Symmetry: C5
Subunit: 95 residues, 5 copies
């Protein structure tokens, strides 16, 4: 298996790593039909989503983003799909 | 996808955004059948979460409200269906 | 729909509001068969249960709520309870 | 329904109350096949398990409760345990 | 049943116990297809994963619980005492964790 988020991210097409090193600025979530999604932003002007639906991992990701937001946990890197707008989170690291 | 709560909210009929910028004043939860969640703010607003991709999102929104309440997190905006009393929560943003 | 716990409570029978305005004193839970239940107490001498069981998920949520309220010493405002059970059975909770 | 952990525990065969009044010393959790279990220890020398399931939701809830009690250093009042297992197997927990 | 993580670990092939006694340095999780996994590291250079579910049917719940545990451990800076890991995987795969 990959040893870290950068190696993991590299195994996928249409991805990149954002090095953030900052807490989440805003956290948004929606239960509205066909838009069951989460959005986060950062002070650097980045906006990322967790896309509407593996199914278990998407739910876990939204759980992680929420508690990271509320606890002001520093996000190190995000691996994101850059063929979606907002870019879609594939992986997160916290250090 | 929508980049923020205001864009998301616009995609539905009978929705509106409320700008709150305040912590939740009260959190009410009911298991009595026919299963309410209710929040209030000091500005005098009352919202509910009404009882599938959507079923899991509904359960998540209730989790988010309880933890926002307990952590005293500032709620930025809510997207609500205004054809229900209290108004019914579609999305939340926290900043 | 109801807009507060007091309004909500009065839409059911065999209920009343306890106005607690206090943290939970103790929290008890059991996985023993037929007694899959939670019990809370307060300083004022009151003992309440979450009865052994969608509505299913509401009951699990209630127990999650009481555990976290207990652990964080969150002030409980009111409980709507069924008073035809012993201990009285929690229908709803408000925290303010 | 029982009004506290002791009454509850008394309804079952092969159980006992351990009165601990202390935080959990160690928390151990396993995903290994056939050993999907939790173990807790106390400073007084006691070791307890949550048995691998063989009630399902309540068993998962109990593991959640033990983990958060441990991390928050929550004082465990009493444990109702089955004593025909080694380690004794947790049926119920009270915190105060 | 085993009474501790070492006894437990000794019942399995291809495992060892790492005695860590330290909080988690980094926590990583991915939802990317066939890489639904968590990775943790420690200051001493250890890297461990919770493997993608591949496992029986009761293990699935326990895999999900482990990832929950590692996330909250990391966020609360809980000292991890020992890990029982399969060492025929890289990163080594977590079978059990003890916290003290
Ligand atoms: C939080 C917020 O207000 N977001 C809105 C904003 O987001 C974009 C802007 O912040 C611009 C400013 O340059 O950057 C876009 O991202 C670029 C990215 O730029 C670099 O990273 C960002 C985070 C900043 O650090 C920039 O200064 C950097 O140069 C490039 O590296 C990348 O190649 O291209 C993207 C654009 O495709 C911001 O876009 C948002 O965030 C990124 C990461 C993507 O997820 C993108 O899809 C997002 O839209 O303005 C946009 C409108 O363009 C929206 O209104 C956001 O709400
Ligand atoms: C917390 C509380 O006391 N709630 C009870 C209260 O709630 C209503 C009042 O607060 C009135 C005062 O005029 O406003 C209602 O909301 C209006 C809304 O007004 C605007 O937003 C509110 C929150 C205040 O800040 C006002 O000053 C604002 O002008 C209008 O913008 C909107 O078009 O219409 C609604 C009414 O539907 C409050 O109603 C509650 O909150 C809103 C957001 C809805 O969800 C609604 O369904 C709620 O009832 O009084 C009512 C009965 O009058 C109940 O007792 C509430 O529990
Ligand atoms: C925490 C504890 O040890 N509880 C045990 C105890 O609880 C009962 C006592 O606390 C008595 C003392 O009067 O009150 C019972 O409650 C009454 C209630 O009284 C009001 O609330 C209590 C908590 C006090 O604050 C009083 O001053 C109040 O007036 C009445 O209003 C109500 O009509 O009747 C109940 C009794 O049926 C306590 O009973 C427990 O808690 C109440 C809220 C119910 O849920 C009831 O079912 C509970 O048993 O004593 C009992 C045995 O009598 C148990 O051992 C409790 O565990
Ligand atoms: C934490 C630890 O190191 N645990 C290992 C240990 O646990 C046993 C010892 O702690 C002995 C020491 O006397 O007591 C056992 O428990 C007894 C119990 O004794 C009393 O209660 C305990 C908690 C202590 O306070 C003692 O001082 C008391 O005398 C009796 O009440 C009971 O009737 O019998 C049990 C034994 O079954 C400890 O056993 C463990 O904990 C108990 C509560 C059970 O769950 C039991 O199954 C456990 O084994 O030693 C054992 C092997 O002997 C393991 O190595 C533990 O890891
Ligand atoms: C945190 C980090 O940056 N990790 C990257 C790193 O990890 C390996 C190194 O840290 C070396 C140091 O020699 O040890 C590897 O583990 C060995 C293990 O060595 C002993 O334990 C570690 C924790 C150190 O304390 C060493 O000093 C010890 O000698 C041996 O006992 C074992 O037989 O072999 C393993 C693997 O070579 C680290 O590997 C990672 O951690 C271990 C526990 C396993 O889970 C392993 O599979 C992991 O890869 O370097 C690797 C590339 O080699 C990656 O870049 C890591 O991200």
């Amino acid at each position: 298996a990959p040893q870290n988020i950068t190696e993991l991210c590299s195994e996928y097409h249409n991805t990149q790593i954002y090095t953030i090193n900052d807490k989440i600025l805003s956290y948004t979530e929606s239960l509205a039909g066909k838009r069951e999604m989460a959005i986060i932003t950062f002070k650097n002007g980045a906006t990322f989503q967790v896309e509407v639906p593996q199914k278990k991992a998407i739910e876990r990701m939204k759980d992680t983003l929420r508690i990271a937001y509320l606890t002001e946990a520093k996000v190190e890197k995000l691996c994101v799909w850059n063929n979606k707008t907002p870019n879609s989170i594939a992986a997160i690291s916290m250090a």
